[PDB]
Amino acid sequence: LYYGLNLLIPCVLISALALLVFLLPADSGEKISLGITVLLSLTVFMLLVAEIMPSTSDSSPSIAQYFASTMIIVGLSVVVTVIVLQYHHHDPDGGKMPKWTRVILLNWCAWFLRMKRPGEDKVRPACQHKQRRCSLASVEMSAVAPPPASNGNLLYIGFRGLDGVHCVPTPDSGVVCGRMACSPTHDEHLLHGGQPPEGDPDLAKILEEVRYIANRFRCQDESEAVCSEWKFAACVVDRLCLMAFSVFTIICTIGILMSAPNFV
Amino acid sequence: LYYGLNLLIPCVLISALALLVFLLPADSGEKISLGITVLLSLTVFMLLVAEIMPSTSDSSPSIAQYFASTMIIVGLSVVVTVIVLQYHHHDPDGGKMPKWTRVILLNWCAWFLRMKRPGEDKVRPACQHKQRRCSLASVEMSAVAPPPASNGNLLYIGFRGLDGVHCVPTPDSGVVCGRMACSPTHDEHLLHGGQPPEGDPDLAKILEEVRYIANRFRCQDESEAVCSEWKFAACVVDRLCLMAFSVFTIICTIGILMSAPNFV
Amino acid sequence: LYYGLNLLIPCVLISALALLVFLLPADSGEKISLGITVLLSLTVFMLLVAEIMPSTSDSSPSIAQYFASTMIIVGLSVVVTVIVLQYHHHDPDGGKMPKWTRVILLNWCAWFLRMKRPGEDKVRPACQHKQRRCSLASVEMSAVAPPPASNGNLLYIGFRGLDGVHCVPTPDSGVVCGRMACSPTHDEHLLHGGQPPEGDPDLAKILEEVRYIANRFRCQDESEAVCSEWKFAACVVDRLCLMAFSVFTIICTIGILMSAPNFV
Amino acid sequence: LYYGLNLLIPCVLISALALLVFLLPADSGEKISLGITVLLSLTVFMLLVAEIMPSTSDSSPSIAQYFASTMIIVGLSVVVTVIVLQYHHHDPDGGKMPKWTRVILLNWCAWFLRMKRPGEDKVRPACQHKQRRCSLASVEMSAVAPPPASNGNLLYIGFRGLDGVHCVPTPDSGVVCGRMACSPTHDEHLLHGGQPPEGDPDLAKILEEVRYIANRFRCQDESEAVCSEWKFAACVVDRLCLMAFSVFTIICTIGILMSAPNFV
Amino acid sequence: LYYGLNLLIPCVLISALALLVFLLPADSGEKISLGITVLLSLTVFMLLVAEIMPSTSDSSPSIAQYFASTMIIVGLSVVVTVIVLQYHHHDPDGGKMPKWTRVILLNWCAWFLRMKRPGEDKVRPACQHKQRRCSLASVEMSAVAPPPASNGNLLYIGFRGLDGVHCVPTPDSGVVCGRMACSPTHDEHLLHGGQPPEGDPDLAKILEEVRYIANRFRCQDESEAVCSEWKFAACVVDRLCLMAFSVFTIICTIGILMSAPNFV
Numbered sequence A, B, C, D, E: 001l002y003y004g005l006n007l008l009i010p011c012v013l014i015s016a017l018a019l020l021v022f023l024l025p026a027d028s029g030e031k032i033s034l035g036i037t038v039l040l041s042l043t044v045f046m047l048l049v050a051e052i053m054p055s056t057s058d059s060s061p062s063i064a065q066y067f068a069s070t071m072i073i074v075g076l077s078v079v080v081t082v083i084v085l086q087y088h089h090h091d092p093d094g095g096k097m098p099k100w101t102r103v104i105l106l107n108w109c110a111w112f113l114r115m116k117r118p119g120e121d122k123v124r125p126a127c128q129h130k131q132r133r134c135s136l137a138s139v140e141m142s143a144v145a146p147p148p149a150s151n152g153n154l155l156y157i158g159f160r161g162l163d164g165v166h167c168v169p170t171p172d173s174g175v176v177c178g179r180m181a182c183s184p185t186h187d188e189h190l191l192h193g194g195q196p197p198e199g200d201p202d203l204a205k206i207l208e209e210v211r212y213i214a215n216r217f218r219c220q221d222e223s224e225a226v227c228s229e230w231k232f233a234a235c236v237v238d239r240l241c242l243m244a245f246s247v248f249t250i251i252c253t254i255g256i257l258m259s260a261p262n263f264v
């Protein structure tokens, strides 16, 4: 098959090259460029088949259907990568502003490690002991702090006190002025050798400027987390479309091997 | 319709792909690249129709008119994205320097949440109570501070005092030297245990350098606001042209379905 | 005119699209990309006219002359944008190193607000009063400080003292040690309660490191001014060529409307 | 050989140009752009050979196979450069997340200076003296610190103490409170002239903010090391494929010079 | 000459456009993009000449030789710009790691101002006085500091002391403890009014963190010097190839004007 080895083989190769675009990180600035070349290569080989196809009036050759399916996968791949830029900015005038989908996306992003589907939800250790039970710590519906861990749960309790123990220690523990744990024990006359405890009020003003500089850097780290939160929502879309297009790509290959004996 | 399923179908798909360019944020550096490919793909199919069209002398086929309208939408899409770069820089030698349009653009940008048109101006809660009334706070024509809020109104009063209460507290409240609210009560002999209140004049000099570093970082945050202000003015242009070109795109599709029975 | 409404029309549109390149800021990194597409689109339509033109031996059709003029404007537009990168770097091994043209460019850049040509030099307020007179302040040929203003003249006197009043106050004003203006009045025994005026020599060392960090940030702001100075010299080149190419573009359009009745 | 000097010559030149892509650093953002042009040029020359090849039904000319090998080398070069972006991000949702290959890659990266293969493992100084012997310092399997050196071994012991001598000096050396080496010799009454050793508790708070700013900058240097660690793993892939494709390129060239006498 | 004014003219124009690539700074990120378009435009015109050239078996027209020289100049221009990226990173796994050429390149870079060739070495002031003589200061082969100047020689002596006078003042000048030049004159009892000279040991710890932050910024300035050092080595390559290709371009133009009367 001269036409089956120079025109059908590139059809699956072009679609297969688009699958790599769905396995790349959302932070890649050159990802959109790669997807453009895939669509460009399809048009180069599409013109050759146009001349072969007879110029009829209402009889559309079945070869055009195969190219349409391939173009949709390649065309949608570029659009999918373009949508990634919206998440990185989410501008009020344009982007993924509606939050009704962000909550759903966040749950899907956290399902990558433990998918709710039977593929991973059921294929995992299971027992009737306390390892799979529930308690007050696990159920945070009543404003219960999550179990401390190294994944970021400790930081949410300490750093993100939210007018809590970190900022305002409402519980009267009696440690600041009732214990010698690096603090005076109700010692109201603890002077700095006859001078006020603070050697210079100017130091407090310097701390405000220094703290603001440190606070601005802290916001930069938090800004990256916000960008990372949108980054995760951008990679799942590529992964979600990778599986959806995988079935379509397989179907197209099957159709070619199944329709050739009847037409070709 | 052999030519209708291979040449007319991409005509509306190419114009539809340009609509996504109008829904992207102005901060996307690769937005211009996406629009270039849309125009490039139109030229590939335009050459094929040229051979089909008879080489006449003064009889212009109606098919060329459709391509002109399609190219205008695609061509203007790239131009619109190019204009976005002007707002991000607004260089004195080139860009949107004239401010007579900036004021109008600012009002339009703020209308996204509450459009002045009947679509959103009239479709909203309305009552004759004080919720829809006016007072001194709402009317800021007489240099009246706006109602404090979390949207940035509090910062304009406190941080942006403009030689006001923050910088020069003209009102004689008698708190700095007439109250014990973290300040002496007319205590001119409040010495630091016999020493001057300031332990070292060098600390003040350090504060000036530290404050300048913090001030420079503050200007960077304000610079982003200026860029954000121009960013909003850039996204509205894309959104404004999206609706304008939507009607034209629909008209072109209607014309094809209405002119084919008479010509095709 | 089948070929006049399909081939001649894009000829002036392609040249008009290059005019937008000359109205963009010099800081746009994607400006060069836009100019490339303009030249690429001209080649697509150029090949079509090649077949139409008879393959003669020494008879060059007049249509080729129009394409040469159009390509020069489009070709020079890309080169002009390429030259912009040289100003942003001005590397010793390559760029606009010779300063004999920088001085002339600086004067031209400052003429944008008040052009020396009669278009703006003569069209402006004029009177015989002191508003248009000259004095010592205006004439800075004898090392006279310019009149203080908010455009940056005050900063050149204060911040850029250059071993002047800011750094070395040569005039014996008798204020530091002869007035109570935030300084001792010749009080050589003004001790810090029996201790040296400086509470710790280590604070001076910290100031040097803090000052260096602040000084480095100051140089970054000055570096932007140097880039801005080259940025202005880059935008004038685009603006200068915009007017020059505007006349050529008009001439080409006139020639087509004037040569067609004799040839076409 | 009219077709050998116009079509066969560029075949090896196109593949040779792809070798430079594998010799570029992984931090180059324009590396992917260079590889795109190489594939684009191959397609331009491939269309010319299509017309020459007779349009048979099932007799595929052997020239097609030669182009397939060249396309694989050029096609895979772009894919290899695309994979580099995955290492720079290694996002959890996409990239080189599995660490089972990272350990192997790290060993390969360190083999560049001293390859385990006989080419460099055997071609090097060898002796039976202590220079090639092993001891406790060389064998770090029992948590033995590596021999201090300037390659980064000293920093791993001092800076990266990991609750060791740098942080918690468990060994009772008796130097802090038992020696005059810039510390008191069990002097519990060493007061600051009657005042506490610390002149102001506010200084400790300032150090925490200053230390955090310095610590954040330290993490930036460590972040570059992590990026450099992935950078090394990205360059070896280019180098690893450079040798593999070199043999294939040589084979393709030999085939042309060996098959031409039988076919051409 | 119908083909001489339509096909030969762009041949020299395409090669001339590549000369601008060799006059651009090495820091231009879009320099590689410009060179790609030059090669792309050559292929458009190359295909047209292919049809004109008769399809012979072993008779290669001389027109192909002219295109080969043009393609080499244009092809090498892109490669030269690609090599620039290698110098900016010089990764151990890829780049200009061998230093045997860096020393030679450094000497060539410094020859731009005063070329060793007779063009500039001989065309310059020359006299037998001490201006062109040599002394100990000029000859630094015996670890002699170079004459201090504003070109960067003073900083190498003071800032880059290398355990010298800046760090360890070995010469016993007797100024720190033997002169009143801002230091005690052997005054071992110079206390801070009865207190230790240092008011707080915590200030020393703060200086270490502040110094590290300043030191890191100093390394960034030194990092740019390393990049600038590689930048100079990258611009000379472009300049070196500019002169080499200038002769070849002139030869190609001469050949066309010399071979046309015999062939054309």
Ligand SMILES: CC[C@H](C)[C@H]1O[C@]2(CC[C@@H]1C)C[C@@H]1C[C@@H](C/C=C(\C)[C@@H](O[C@H]3C[C@H](OC)[C@@H](O[C@H]4C[C@H](OC)[C@@H](O)[C@H](C)O4)[C@H](C)O3)[C@@H](C)/C=C/C=C3\CO[C@@H]4[C@H](O)C(C)=C[C@@H](C(=O)O1)[C@]34O)O2
Residues within 6 Å of the ligand: A001, A005, A006, A007, A009, A010, A012, A013, D064, D065, D067, D068, D071, D072
């Ligand atoms: C695995 C294929 C994918 C697409 C891979 O292709 C690559 C790598 C990338 C993909 C992963 C590239 C590809 C070559 C393939 C490897 C294949 C071959 C070298 C040859 O074919 C094989 C398989 C083929 O049977 C599928 C088989 O025919 C038999 C069995 C069939 O019954 C199942 C039967 O009907 C048939 C009658 O007899 C055949 C004998 O032998 C070779 C024939 C294919 C060459 C294809 C290239 C030649 O010019 C083309 C052009 O330049 C283009 C644009 C892409 C090239 C390409 O795409 O080249 C190209 O189309 O690898």
Ligand SMILES: CC[C@H](C)[C@H]1O[C@]2(CC[C@@H]1C)C[C@@H]1C[C@@H](C/C=C(\C)[C@@H](O[C@H]3C[C@H](OC)[C@@H](O[C@H]4C[C@H](OC)[C@@H](O)[C@H](C)O4)[C@H](C)O3)[C@@H](C)/C=C/C=C3\CO[C@@H]4[C@H](O)C(C)=C[C@@H](C(=O)O1)[C@]34O)O2
Residues within 6 Å of the ligand: A060, A064, A065, A067, A068, A071, A072, B001, B005, B006, B007, B009, B010, B013
């Ligand atoms: C919603 C359509 C848009 C264009 C979508 O297109 C895509 C996705 C993107 C758009 C959202 C891509 C498109 C396919 C379409 C889906 C359509 C089909 C698979 C087929 O058509 C449908 C609809 C069509 O009736 C509009 C209908 O005809 C009937 C009803 C008509 O009366 C209303 C009547 O007159 C007519 C006589 O009988 C038909 C039977 O069935 C299929 C025929 C279309 C194939 C088109 C592709 C084939 O090679 C082309 C080439 O490669 C190119 C450059 C783009 C491709 C494409 O553009 O492919 C391509 O042109 O989806």
Ligand SMILES: CC[C@H](C)[C@H]1O[C@]2(CC[C@@H]1C)C[C@@H]1C[C@@H](C/C=C(\C)[C@@H](O[C@H]3C[C@H](OC)[C@@H](O[C@H]4C[C@H](OC)[C@@H](O)[C@H](C)O4)[C@H](C)O3)[C@@H](C)/C=C/C=C3\CO[C@@H]4[C@H](O)C(C)=C[C@@H](C(=O)O1)[C@]34O)O2
Residues within 6 Å of the ligand: B060, B064, B065, B067, B068, B069, B071, B072, C001, C005, C006, C007, C009, C010, C012, C013
């Ligand atoms: C204002 C024109 C500029 C170029 C603008 O063009 C755009 C916007 C961009 C520019 C600012 C794009 C352009 C359409 C125009 C608007 C014009 C029309 C829709 C029609 O034309 C008008 C004007 C024309 O008279 C100049 C007039 O003819 C009359 C008067 C003449 O005497 C002065 C006389 O001699 C003549 C015999 O009868 C005509 C009847 O009606 C429409 C007919 C033009 C179609 C455009 C062409 C179709 O495919 C061409 C090309 O393959 C491509 C890539 C794009 C098209 C285009 O270029 O589309 C294209 O070239 O707007």
Ligand SMILES: CC[C@H](C)[C@H]1O[C@]2(CC[C@@H]1C)C[C@@H]1C[C@@H](C/C=C(\C)[C@@H](O[C@H]3C[C@H](OC)[C@@H](O[C@H]4C[C@H](OC)[C@@H](O)[C@H](C)O4)[C@H](C)O3)[C@@H](C)/C=C/C=C3\CO[C@@H]4[C@H](O)C(C)=C[C@@H](C(=O)O1)[C@]34O)O2
Residues within 6 Å of the ligand: C060, C064, C065, C067, C068, C069, C071, C072, E001, E005, E006, E007, E009, E010, E012, E013
């Ligand atoms: C200085 C030339 C360089 C290439 C410059 O070209 C540009 C600017 C860039 C370069 C610096 C661009 C160029 C135009 C030139 C300026 C030249 C003209 C407007 C005309 O030509 C002149 C010179 C020519 O004699 C060299 C002369 O012929 C005479 C003397 C010859 O004896 C020496 C003799 O043999 C001959 C028989 O009669 C001629 C009469 O008059 C104009 C006629 C040239 C048209 C240009 C061509 C038209 O489409 C071509 C190509 O498809 C394309 C893409 C661009 C065009 C171009 O290349 O346009 C193109 O190739 O400027």
Ligand SMILES: CC[C@H](C)[C@H]1O[C@]2(CC[C@@H]1C)C[C@@H]1C[C@@H](C/C=C(\C)[C@@H](O[C@H]3C[C@H](OC)[C@@H](O[C@H]4C[C@H](OC)[C@@H](O)[C@H](C)O4)[C@H](C)O3)[C@@H](C)/C=C/C=C3\CO[C@@H]4[C@H](O)C(C)=C[C@@H](C(=O)O1)[C@]34O)O2
Residues within 6 Å of the ligand: D001, D005, D006, D007, D009, D010, D012, D013, E060, E064, E065, E067, E068, E071, E072
């Ligand atoms: C080292 C070659 C590589 C490809 C280098 O090519 C470059 C530089 C880049 C590579 C490193 C580019 C190349 C030219 C070559 C230098 C070669 C020549 C100027 C000529 O050829 C040589 C070698 C050739 O023998 C291999 C030899 O034939 C002999 C010996 C053969 O027996 C071994 C025997 O069978 C045969 C019958 O008689 C020949 C006489 O003399 C010249 C003839 C080739 C020119 C080719 C160019 C001309 O238009 C072409 C077009 O534009 C294209 C797309 C690429 C060009 C190119 O590719 O140009 C081009 O195809 O250098």
